[PDB]
Amino acid sequence: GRVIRGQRKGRGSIFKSHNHHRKGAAKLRHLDYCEKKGYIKGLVKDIIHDPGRGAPLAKVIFKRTEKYGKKEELIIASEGMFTGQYISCGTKAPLSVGNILPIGKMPEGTLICNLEHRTGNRGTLVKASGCYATVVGQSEDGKKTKVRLPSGAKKTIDAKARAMVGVVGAGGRIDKPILKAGVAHHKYRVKRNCWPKVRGVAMNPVEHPHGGGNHQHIGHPSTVSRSAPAGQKVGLIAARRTGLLRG
RNA sequence: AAUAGGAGUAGCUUGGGGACAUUCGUAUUCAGAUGUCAGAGGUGAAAUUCUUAGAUUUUCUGGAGACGAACAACUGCGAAAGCAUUUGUCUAAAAUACUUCCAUUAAUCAAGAACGAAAGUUAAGGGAGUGAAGACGAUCAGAUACCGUCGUAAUCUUAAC
RNA sequence: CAUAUUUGGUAGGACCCGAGAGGCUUUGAACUAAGCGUGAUGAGAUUGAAGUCAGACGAAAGUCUGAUGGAGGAUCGAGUUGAUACUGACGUGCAAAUCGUUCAUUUCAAUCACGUUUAGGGGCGAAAGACUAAUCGAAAAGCCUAUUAGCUGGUUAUUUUCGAAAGAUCUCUCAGGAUCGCUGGAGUUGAUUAAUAUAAUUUUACCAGGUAGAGAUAAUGAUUAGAGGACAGGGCCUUGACCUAU
RNA sequence: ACAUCUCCCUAGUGCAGAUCUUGGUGGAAGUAGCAACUAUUCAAAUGAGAACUUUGAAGACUGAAGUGGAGAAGGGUUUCUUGUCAACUGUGAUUGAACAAGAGUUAGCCGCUCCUAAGGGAUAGCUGAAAAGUGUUUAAAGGGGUCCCCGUCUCAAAAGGGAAACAGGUUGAUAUUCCUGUGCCAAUAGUAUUAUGAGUUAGAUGGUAACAUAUAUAUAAAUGAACUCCUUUACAUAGGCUUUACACUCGGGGUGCGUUUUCUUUGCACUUUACCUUUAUAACAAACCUUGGAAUCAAUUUACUUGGAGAAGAGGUUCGUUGAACUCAAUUCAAAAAUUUGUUUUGUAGCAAUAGUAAUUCGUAAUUAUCCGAAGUGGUAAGGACUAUCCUUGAAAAAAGGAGGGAACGGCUUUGUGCUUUGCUACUCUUAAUACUUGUAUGAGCGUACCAACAACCGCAUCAGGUCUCCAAGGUUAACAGCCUCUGGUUAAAUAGAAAAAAGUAGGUAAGGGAAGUCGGCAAAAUAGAUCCGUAACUUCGGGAAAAGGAUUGGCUCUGAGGACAUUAAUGUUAACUCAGAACUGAAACGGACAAGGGGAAUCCGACUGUUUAAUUAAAACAUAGCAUUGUGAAAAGCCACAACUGGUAUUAACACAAUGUGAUUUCUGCCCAGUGCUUUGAAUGUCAACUUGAUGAAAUUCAAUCAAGCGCAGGUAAACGGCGGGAGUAACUAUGACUCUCUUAAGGUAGCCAAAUGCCUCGUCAUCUAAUUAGUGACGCGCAUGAAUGGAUUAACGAGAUUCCCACUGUCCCUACUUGCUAUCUAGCGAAACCACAGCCAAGGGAACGGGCUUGGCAAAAUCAGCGGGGAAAGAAGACCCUGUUGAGCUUUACUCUAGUCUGGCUUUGUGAAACGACUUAAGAGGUGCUACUUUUAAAGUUGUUUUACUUAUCCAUUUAUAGGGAUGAAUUUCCCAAUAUGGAGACAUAGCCAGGUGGGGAGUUUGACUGGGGCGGUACAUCUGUUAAAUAUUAACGCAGAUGUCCAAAGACAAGCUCAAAGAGAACAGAAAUCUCUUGUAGACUAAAAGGGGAAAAGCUUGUUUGAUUUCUAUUUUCAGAACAAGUAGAAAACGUGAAAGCGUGGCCUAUCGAUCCUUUAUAUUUGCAAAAUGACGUAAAUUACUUACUACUGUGCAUAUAGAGGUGUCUGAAAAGUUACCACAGGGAUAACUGGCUUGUGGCUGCCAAGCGCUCCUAGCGACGUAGCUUUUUGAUCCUUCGAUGUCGGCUCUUCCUAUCAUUGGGACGCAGAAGUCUCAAAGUGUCGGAUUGUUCACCCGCUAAUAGGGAACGUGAGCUGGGUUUAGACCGUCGUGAGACAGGUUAG
Structure with a gap:
């Protein structure tokens, strides 16, 4: 059909992301020898808003270890971060909120954010506003560490991999309801080309397979296999249970 | 200076009074193991139900929610509602004592206000057991009930009511 | 056998003309769609949120009342952008959608410009199969291509001679085809001896019949009456059936 | 230039036609027409000629959102001057945007040009046969530095960023650009001179401070390297406040003109001032500093702001506005004083008056005189300080600037090696100018007309269309509105004139009534501005709301309220306009024109602001917030793209991305996991692939064996798809049925809801509204076919929504009339088209069944002008409807065949060890019936295959400018101990390649018969068999009739032999109507496998005996019929037999039915064959023996192929492997075929009869009239398919006329069951009449009312170039039911 x-x-086309308002990639400090063996203290010089990210970025100054003068990083701002806050990063760094530490050096039940799936991957996990992970265990012979994702899922990563103490800024953002269609427009204007999000069942069956039927019938199962073709994967892929969630 | 009232001060006074943090125990439950081999659950009496893909039963780890038993009483505190693990913090309270201070401040109170079990509402968590609804097996003259097995909403916390 | 010409059949454009299509390679987003960047543009009025002040009452908690204040995808609203209705005018137009009057829109999901992105079973779509340059349920250009068409239309001087069928069989066959029938040409045989062969004809012989007719007293199926006789019903008598000729 | 007919060859060889092709041309016709946009007149001039050329005078208009200026796109000499009139300038034409000849656009400063962005193109790579697809991503690459430190490139904005020019003048046409004047900017090489200030005997100063300081012709010059850090460039929206400028107004003096009978100390015009001078100062909103030290809070804005983290106060300083303000400068005199203030005189601060304006005189073109004092409005624009909003915080680089840092450092003379130590003291900097040398030592290139539509662009064109941006005067007013005015512009629009009726169109206006109108109050009218009152139901408490409903409003003369300055609380000087009140006044008229809500009572749907079908569609559809759902933790994830490599989501990370469903609020969301889905676990487990492994054979082969997934088994899931019953009985009246019973499912509809845009029946029943209610509204609810995220139920606000009603209101209507413009009309001018077989009076007839021509009748006498719509089955477009095609296309599925995707298995890439598991080999032993022969057990001894695991170098990912080996809100630049692949991560699994099973409407390609009383459901008349139809040989059709068929049979076959059946009567224990037995009678009345019809009695029936001929081979034939096939038969023959005593009979069934090509498969069969140069018995039988000896032999490997014979099947049966769907559709045909008329017929409908049994007290017939029976008609409905599908416009209403009679009334009568009054039946009669509403889509129907009565029909179902468009019936949409679905519905609804 169509x-x-x-x-x-x-x-690709007009569906590429709206990056104009966005201030640069939000990846943490890279691993280096100074981080590995010791620690570096830096100063948070400014906090800035990015609308693609759910929370602010923090402009942090370190002084060039291999050279001379001041170097600027972009970190994701933890809640309770402030301008003129000192941030410490490294193996021998002290435990405190917003510090950047290997997960092995956290005591259990601590709350952390900006996890990386491998060391020096620069905070690839746990980046959304108000969010946090919990350390849920430390290996008896070390090397691995067990942490809990903001989905509630548990995962085991190497102890060496870094994370950032505390919870991400701008929490509770989802608690306010969306007031109106213009507010929704302003949200999608800085996100992606993705809206208005028209129903498939309304359309021609030719141009969306939930479509057709004189009185807008679905006419076929809305639960689809993950084994299905991409153009057949319109419905609910690999749906283990459907209906209202209960219990 | 009231066998009235208020305020003070004193004592390693008192107590499950209130709030916040903290911490322990156990059963239960789940997951991971563990060893068995035929039944196990369940009742007026059975069946529905679970079990050879190893149930029930044994022992161990790890997790989770729940509660605080026995001790525990013609026992304590609280305005009432209500309040029982450990320690800490912030708090209030009454009596006793007083050759301490005040000098009638009082009593009960339409109006108005605060707090107010259980359930109910609304939102976020959490959601183990228990379990309105609901589902089967019976029971029985029939039974939509008592009884059995399963089981959502709710019970728990925060935030409003 | 060779050769000349013919006519018929078959393949080819094959009597000329006619589709809807299908494939291949290019070209378009000046319109229009959605997205983007850089810029602009939006008379005038109306309502009067929060906050602030003042005053009043209230033991208290608190409550009122008047200003101020200046919120809202708030209100009306010229214009701008549209285009509801008059089924208005117009309907060989001023115009292959205009014009008049009415009406909706007017501070935001706004409007406008320019530049830019995404291209054909592809895009893009606040979904109507919408739009993608007077082109769309698959754009434009060129070609395979003179595509194919059992179907529609047309198919050109003269005289003379013979002159039909619209039955049949098989057919994914019923608007068609093939093959039979009927027709023509060409030849040969027979014929010329008033004949024999021969014949949509009768004659005399000779058969074969079961339709019209006719029949119920011949059978079958019907079917209306009485009469004469030796198992049953009614209330020793009567009714029937049943036999027998009608 | 032409012939040949003398003969003969050859051909692009003969036209009326093809909606033929091409070209020309007519009738239509001097007609249609030249109608947007308020208007021209007079005179003159030019010229051949003037309504529309030019000049003047008038009249007018555009009316600052302009037909006015400017610019962008686009055009491109269209510009301009000078000519000019063949054609053009839809009239005229001397005009011209036509034609001809020329002329004309001048830039260091305005743009482009430059910079980067969204973007684009490449290098580096890598893929892909290439073409291309990508773009730092596995690089030995443009810059700065004494060999070192940095770096992907490139194009991309004429509105972003971006140095630097203005004023006046001037041309026929350009001017920021030419000219005059004044400036501004960037560079501006070397060397030598000079002047300018610095510093020296290697870097100034003041100020407590914030900060300031060079005034040289010229504010020049105030040390500084690497390496660093900032900042400008550089940014949203909304609301007020405020400052300046231009604009606007008033008042005064000065100038000229204007009005001037009368009045006016009047009206108008002019009274000018730029850049540039970091312009100097003044002023002010801010910011900051010193002092100061605040609760009794103060300072303070329209707004709240600020303060011990230091406010008020006092005194400064800075920035920004501004741009001569103000002592600003000079001079003067007085005082300060060894530099400062006061007073006078000057000056538009320079630019600057010489330039501009109004003037004034004087002619070759020159002079003179003039040019300024106060203020108010708040319209533009910009800035400022602020304040608020975002689940959105609002580009970048080139370029420029500031700060940090502390590398480097006099000149002369001289040793030693551009470096170092000694001795000496105008020197070292720094701007500008000059001279001299060094290529020629200053300014690139492009654009610049005109239009910007009122004719230059796009629209096929001087097209009422479209087409971006800025400039914005006065009055009225809220006003950039509307109306009128000034500046500027224009009076051209494809024509004029004359006349003025119809008719048209754009407008007006109308008595009395007031929606009786129609689809609907459509249209039109009424309402309408402000100010003052007053404002309901209901409500999500915000709204409703300008609700509703009232009142007021002119002009004049008064009164009050609201400022600013300065004299000590009073007195003065002095302003803008707005409000409020009161008199008087008038035709109570007054928002006067001008703009300018009609409302209410309700129902229904969608909550809302939003959006949509470009040109028939704005909504009830879609979006939307809100609710819910699924998947996914990550480079080996989700979700998507690409051939491949590679991308996108992703500058991403569960408060996320992707995928869905529902659709504000409110209230809730019952049952079912069976079906169809999706999903969870797996060797116990059924099925189930390649490879692999073993067994077999000589091998090919043939066999087994194998934890693949999938399915299957077993769970989970309904806010997955979906679905949600039937009967009986039952209560002291009557009724119903809580209650009882029951079959049945996966569950049997719960909360609700209703004849609702949802109820077939149905216009359901009751109310209520009306006058009348099929409508509306409230109900009822066994509901064809309501109902719970198919979201149900309910909702205020809200609507270019659908619907009803009421009030105001009205020319909708009674019932039309009068009127204006513009047209029409007539003239002059210019000047088409569609259409057209030939044509053009009727009537009837026949006819292809409705004739303009034909036949017979009526008839029929030129030419026209103005109209009009009866006809030309008028025009058009190859019927969009319907049917048909072995044409399509679109769409869907559990149609057929695939396939992208995807999962899973296998092999390669793919290495290295270790442990555990098996096989094999070597060592030692053992056992057996005569110098000679054989076989077995044990090592975990040696080698090898497997499972588990460790390791990394293969491989893969990640990371960074590839940066110390491991262990205890400053500033950073010239340890100790252990150790001796860029870094991690993953890793022999991935991955990739190649195979293989599975999944696979995601995508592809295709199929979805025929006959057919149209199409379709149905049937088979589609292969067949009987009788009959069938008309006496035979032949013969229909969806003719009555039927049968797809077999059955080891006997029900074959032969022989014997017998006679059905029945009836008469008899016999149990025993009867039927049981068995007997006698008599018995032409078949039985039976013959099965249909129906034929035939059959010593049988063809029944019983019995023997058997298998129901056998092999072959003809001639007969049937169907081609006289082919197949199938069925008949008569024989050649065999072998079976049976009978023999004759004989037996080649299936007593006869007429019981069935199937080619290709293919399969088993039979053969002294017959083949597998392509040869062979496979067998060296057989002989001889020979040095050997490639020599003869002679019917019988010769596996496998495949044949040949002949069957069988396995095609029932759409002379033989495609083939489902749905189109109201999104297209094409080819079709009157070979529906829906429309007509036609034939008249079943059905309607009308009229005949009769005589009854009824009519009594009485056949006054009136009736059955049971019966005859006609007529086509206003009924049918039957039909002759006519038309290259089109006869598909219902109804309105309007308008005519015909009929089968008369309802009026006229004349007849009869009566008739006393009269009536009334009833009836005849001549078609002269005349036959109505208002309510309800409808309506013929019809049905109320209410009038009437005098409210008859019935025809006219192409009267009447669409007469109208209307409500309805059936295009494309959008809704609900129910049906369909898996897409979709469907003479089911209902809205928009067209």
């Missing part, structure tokens, strides 16, 4: 909207989205 290609479905989700399949059309991957052709």
